Symmetry: D2
Subunit: 331 residues, 4 copies
């Protein structure tokens, strides 16, 4: 076995066709354009590789065996690491001036980054929903045809990471009312602590406190949630949300240490996915002038685990957090 043959470089390193050259006027910087995109696509494939694997672990119920949690967090962190690189990779294309890109931009028409099948498959597999997806020029799948359109559909219809994480989050231990009844203990301890606290600048604080109280108690409005879920402003089942907050509050508890890491990485992937979009935009600006559709992609509308980010709003004094009783200290 030789490197070149192991890596099918006969394919990889014979995939560069400068359209400028194909049309008689070869432009040098076009090479970079091609390579950059090809590298992105390689890495997308790797992310899909990792993601699909993680999805499978959830779907096949392997995640139930908490031995598989190391594997899950490892592969999720790996995604975040690839993404961190893909963000830095824009620095490479920033070496191309707009003036120089202009010299071949025409031979690209009518092509677009939009037509990255993998990027869409990625958005889909994480949990970006078309219902909340910004339409571009009153139009995404329309541009894709064939097996591509077919796969794109499977991607939308098969379980997303969000869905699968939701499922698992719903089964998070300690939610059982017959058990630790976290939610009940929480509502009580908060209401109590609230009242205790509720017993000039005073007025200002009072006003602030009423605002805080509303938010804090908003947590227990199952209906508010269902509504927001419908409007798509939240994404996680109320039960899943409970499991997540369980994990947040009892993270140091051994059974919840890696699960918390997952949540952290899930948020990191959202953060990075959006950083990708941002860097892409800042460039398309520097390259095409005036952008706005893309500036719209950086809107938290594409944050799939936005629920995890927003659990920061509902932070309470440590004192108020239900205690780890002997029984659960065992469990």
């Amino acid at each position: 076995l030789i490197y070149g043959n192991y890596l099918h470089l006969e394919k990889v390193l014979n995939a560069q066709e400068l359209q400028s050259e194909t049309k008689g006027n070869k432009i040098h910087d076009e090479h970079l354009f091609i390579i950059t995109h090809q590298a992105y696509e390689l890495w997308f494939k790797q992310i899909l590789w990792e993601l699909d694997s993680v999805r499978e672990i959830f779907q096949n119920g392997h995640v139930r065996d908490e031995r598989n949690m190391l594997k899950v967090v490892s592969r999720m962190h790996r995604v975040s690491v690839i993404l961190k690189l893909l963000v830095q990779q824009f620095s490479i294309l920033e070496t191309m001036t707009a003036l120089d890109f202009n010299d071949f931009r025409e031979y690209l028409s009518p092509a677009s980054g939009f037509q990255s099948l993998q990027f869409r498959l990625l958005e889909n597999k994480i949990g970006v929903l078309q219902n909340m997806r910004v339409p571009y020029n009153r139009r995404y799948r329309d541009n894709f045809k064939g097996e591509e359109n077919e796969l794109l559909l499977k991607s939308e219809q098969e379980k997303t990471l969000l869905e699968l994480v939701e499922a698992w989050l719903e089964r998070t231990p300690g939610l059982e009312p017959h058990g630790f009844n976290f939610w009940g203990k929480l509502e009580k301890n908060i209401t109590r602590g609230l009242e205790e606290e509720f017993i000039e600048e005073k007025e200002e604080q009072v006003a602030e406190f009423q605002k805080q109280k509303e938010v804090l108690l908003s947590l227990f409005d199952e209906k508010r949630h269902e509504h927001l879920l419908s409007k798509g402003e939240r994404r996680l089942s109320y039960r899943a949300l409970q499991g997540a907050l369980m994990i947040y509050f009892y993270r140091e508890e051994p059974r919840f240490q890696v699960p918390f890491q997952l949540l952290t990485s899930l948020m990191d992937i959202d953060s990075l996915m959006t950083k990708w979009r941002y860097n892409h935009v800042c460039m398309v600006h520097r390259m095409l002038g005036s952008y706005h559709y893309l500036r719209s992609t950086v809107s938290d509308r594409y944050k799939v685990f936005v629920d995890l980010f927003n659990l920061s709003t509902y932070l309470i004094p440590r004192h108020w957090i239900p205690k780890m009783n002997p029984t659960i200290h065992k469990f």
Copy 2:
């Protein structure tokens, strides 16, 4: 034209074949290994693209037209930027544990990164010389390569390297002409003078430990500084391969260093800086590679590799070492108005 078809993704995204899977026992992390290498190879191709272009500009004498200097420095900086990324790219493969790599390392033998044609072409096109190449397994590197590959690899060694081409251009650097600004002459004189002047300074110091310190500092500096004009020392070191640039080229480089602010020398200096950046980064690549192979294979290619992280692989080491011959600014020959115009 569709993106997928423009980018020949039919090829790119149909090039991943897990040998573990080909042999029945698919290992997940093997995918990463493949992709990582494929990305490296893509980027190598791009670097070769840039480098070959720069070489051509030098060889076809376009570099004489100083309008092409922007293009040259841009493309050279771009190389350094790709390399910066290729160094960071190791962070990705560091996500793979040794334990997990072990689960497929077998299905790789007898393949190695050594068989990267592009990496070799790259080493060669910059200016790595086979004479000063550390032997692998008591043998040459091209021994591992056969066919058109071996053929190309030779062309790469024999065709003009960036070093050679930069040397040529450095030799033509204005200001060296003795009939002109006579930089080298003025320099030798101004250094001789400065040294003497400083000696008197130290002589003035009543004998003390302080004076002693200065004395030692002085003598070492003097030796080094005058070493610069020992054209024979140079020729010797050139032979031993410890330097690489013609003495004339070395003069042009120091010209550029000292008169960098001069408009004609501003971008030329940037080039020199980038040339050094490429060496620095190429070495950082090697270092990160080694640091990983250690984490992955334990402890020995490791030792062979630890050997490749040396000035033997640094092509523009001469540019780095011009830092040793740094002098007080007031010693630097003053740009004569006439030649001040020439620059």
Copy 3:
């Protein structure tokens, strides 16, 4: 002389006071919070150092001596490099969980990064204009600052900004002189001509939707391209604050863009590129800051900040927008050998 004494580490490394600890309940992650900010502030000081130096080079007219161009681009690139780092530095504070920050956030009230004198000095010295600055809680920013601080902050606003100084220099860009190369005239002509020539091409074409599409494209392009020569449109946009550069400065910048390979314009172009890099990175800083305040406080300042990530805080947005007015290379006015002389140093 000792390292520690050279670097006044007696000060630097005795400047960490955890308020949590000062109040009896020391929280560990507070140390990180302090250090991170202190490092940012060190780097801000360095950027101000570089910026002020470059401003002075422009103000004192040293920039006229094109020897100083290397120094200028070097120091400007250095800023962009510091900024690149400052953006990555958020990764450090991302190690702090919101849960853990919550354990000391209280001992901070009412303090805020908003009270970063240096950040404001920086925004100001580059060219952020108060009129373009989104007010927070219906209030100005300097209103939070008092004393010599307010005095400095004012000097920053009143002294020449980099924008102003670059504008001045851009206006003196060679090639614009009508008596000389008359770039703008030649350009208007060459563009008007080219457009006509292209219109004919399209009109020659065999009736199709593709033709219609090209027709549409053509009108759009034509409008934009000719918009360039509407000095009144410019003055209007300047008023609306969509542009920031004088029309003449804009001419000089496009001169440099189009004739960058010309020796005299090689480093000047690099400067333009760096100026844009600084804006890009400054905005990336703001973005990462926001993305974190979200991760930390949830969803409001957050929205104020989300507002700061706009081209309204981009000082050299005009340089970014010169990409809109890109023309076929063959349309660019030709450099006379004789003319190449004023661009050959």
Copy 4:
């Protein structure tokens, strides 16, 4: 409470004294030099903050409560993140040319980065051993430091290092107990067996160059694999300082490596990974430092430093070298339900 006052910026931003300026000939790039170092020092303080905290968790036996494992790995990862940045931070100082540094290097003598108390404290607290410290021009390291400096430096040397503390904890790693899972025994057996089994396979083959190659490989592997059970070889190497961990600690580490997916070993493995990352990064720091001092001073400290980039400075080299003793997975002693149940929480 004001930002500036919280952060004692009266100190931090009044700690820049350009010696060039103090001596009449201010050099611009000296500012950068100062700031860069000051930032490094801030971050070192933070690393020491994190490290000391982790050391205390180990020393005070809090690590026994496996709730505190999350905290430990988090803080150790944070160190690695700071270090990643400190490595990138050299990019900033690379903006300074040697030519320009030369213009002030004189006013620095006789100061040096060597005199970073914090860096030494850091090296010491991790586990760099004074024995294996390469002498600089036949000089010690501590010799340069006097007073409280020397005092603290010693405490750092004498107090428990991270290595020592990790060793302690590694020795208490569950599964090693002979009356329990007897990992070591089961391992030796399973390895001896596997090797024999493989030898037979090769013996069954027909004499050939391939066979010889395999045979040679097999003997090499066998030696290494069985070397693992030579407690005395270890003790010797420990003496020569080629290894650092007790043989029992080494057993615990390999336990963790092999049974990492086991819940009780998942975070512990992460720690090991981060410990190795800290070595890797600490050494990357040294490398980048050297690469620069060369670019700045030419080629000597350079060579002394090139010496610091060795496994002689790698504290957790034992963790790196556990990669040598990797065996087929099927050879690894199996976690029987009963004992698996012991390793859960």
